[PDB]
Amino acid sequence: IIGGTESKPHSRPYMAYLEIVTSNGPSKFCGGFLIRRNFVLTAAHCAGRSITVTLGAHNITEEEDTWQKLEVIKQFRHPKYNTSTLHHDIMLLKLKEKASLTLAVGTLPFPSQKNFVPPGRMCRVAGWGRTGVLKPGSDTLQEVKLRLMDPQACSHFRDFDHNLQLCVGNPRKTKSAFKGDSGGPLLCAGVAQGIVSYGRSDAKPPAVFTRISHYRPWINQILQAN
Ligand SMILES: CN(C)C(=O)Cc1c(C(=O)O)n(Cc2csc3ccc(F)cc23)c2ccccc12
Ligand SMILES: [Zn+2]
Numbered sequence: 001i002i003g004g005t006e007s008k009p010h011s012r013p014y015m016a017y018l019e020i021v022t023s024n025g026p027s028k029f030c031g032g033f034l035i036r037r038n039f040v041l042t043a044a045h046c047a048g049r050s051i052t053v054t055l056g057a058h059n060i061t062e063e064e065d066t067w068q069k070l071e072v073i074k075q076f077r078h079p080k081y082n083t084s085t086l087h088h089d090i091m092l093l094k095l096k097e098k099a100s101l102t103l104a105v106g107t108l109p110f111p112s113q114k115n116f117v118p119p120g121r122m123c124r125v126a127g128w129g130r131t132g133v134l135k136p137g138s139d140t141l142q143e144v145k146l147r148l149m150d151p152q153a154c155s156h157f158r159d160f161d162h163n164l165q166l167c168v169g170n171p172r173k174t175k176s177a178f179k180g181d182s183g184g185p186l187l188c189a190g191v192a193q194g195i196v197s198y199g200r201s202d203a204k205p206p207a208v209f210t211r212i213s214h215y216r217p218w219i220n221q222i223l224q225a226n
Contacts, residue, residue: 001127002203003175004144009058010066012126014108015141016040017057018093018183020048029137031127031184033192034107037098039223040072042183043197043210044081044091051075051093056104060128061139066104071096076222078215085159089197090210091183092222108185108192114216117166119150123188125168125196125209129180133203137180144175148188149206157198157208164214166194169205176205 007015016032018040032042032053040053056066073096078088099105126143130136147170151162160167168186169176177184177196186194186209199207212219 001125001129001138001142001144001181002132002178003173004142007058007126007141007143010056010104012141012143013056013104013106015057015126015184016042017054017060017128018042018046019052019054020046021050022048029128029180030182031129031196032093033185034099034105035109036107036223037101038095040093040095041195041219042091042093043195044077044089045086045198046183047075047077047091053093053095055099056102057141059140066102068099068105070099076226078218086198086208087159087161087164088215090195090215090218092219094226110212110216110219111191114213116213117148117188117193117211119148119167121148121188122146123148123168123186123193125177125181125184125186125194127177127181127184127196129182130178144177146170146175146177146186146205153206154208160208164211165197166209166211167206168194168209169207171205173205174203176203177207177209178203
């Protein structure tokens with residue numbers, strides 16, 4: 001998160017810190033959010049050979065009792081996830097066990113409504129991602145309020161699609177989700193509407209978020225089947 005604030009610790013108790021293992025490189029990290037006690041939603045590009053989720057974190061470098069380090073038993077990457085277009089950059093992680101609900105860990109279930117969120121409002125995204133291009137991932141959960149932009153603000157992402165994705169972050173500001181924030185929720189009035197997907201390497205907003213409304217059926221499908 002660039003240009004954000006440190007979250008009040010544990011104020012976003014659904015936030016998941018994902019450590020994503022691959023065979024051929026060191027861990028990568030993503031965010032995500034717990035939408036059921038045993039499911040974390042994140043970005044598909046956060047898939048890996050295995051993923052650990054840490055719930056209850058604030059400073060991810062400082063173990064604390066709020067932490068729940070949970071094994072992911074299965075990744076449900078959106079079947080249409082396209083590594084070229086980055087369409088359908090969404091993934092559900094089924095945790096091996098249901099997380100404990102604590103003050104610091106709770107789910108963020110979707111409201112029934114899955115209304116398409118038009119441009120214009122401010123939403124908040126949180127993550128432990130980089131706080132600038134040259135900055136490592138934040139030890140602490142950060143969050144930033146970003147403007148939902150009209151889709152044309154993301155035109156330059158040539159595979160951006162307004163129906164699939166939110167365009168997030170006023171380009172006039174440096175505030176943005178960034179690397180390491182992948183998979184984090186964009187909450188608009190406390191409702192997850194976006195998932196950090198991608199943006200420019202140089203961190204110039206807007207960034208592209210998966211538009212959750214579009215994937216609600218798929219999410220539901222996975223949740224109901226698993
Ligand atoms: C498993 N991971 C994390 C990786 O493989 C590396 C990776 C990252 C990352 O490092 O976060 N992002 C997000 C990202 C890149 S530039 C940018 C700008 C603004 C913004 F919000 C997000 C982003 C990806 C998107 C698609 C494919 C891969 C990645
Ligand atoms: Zn704490």
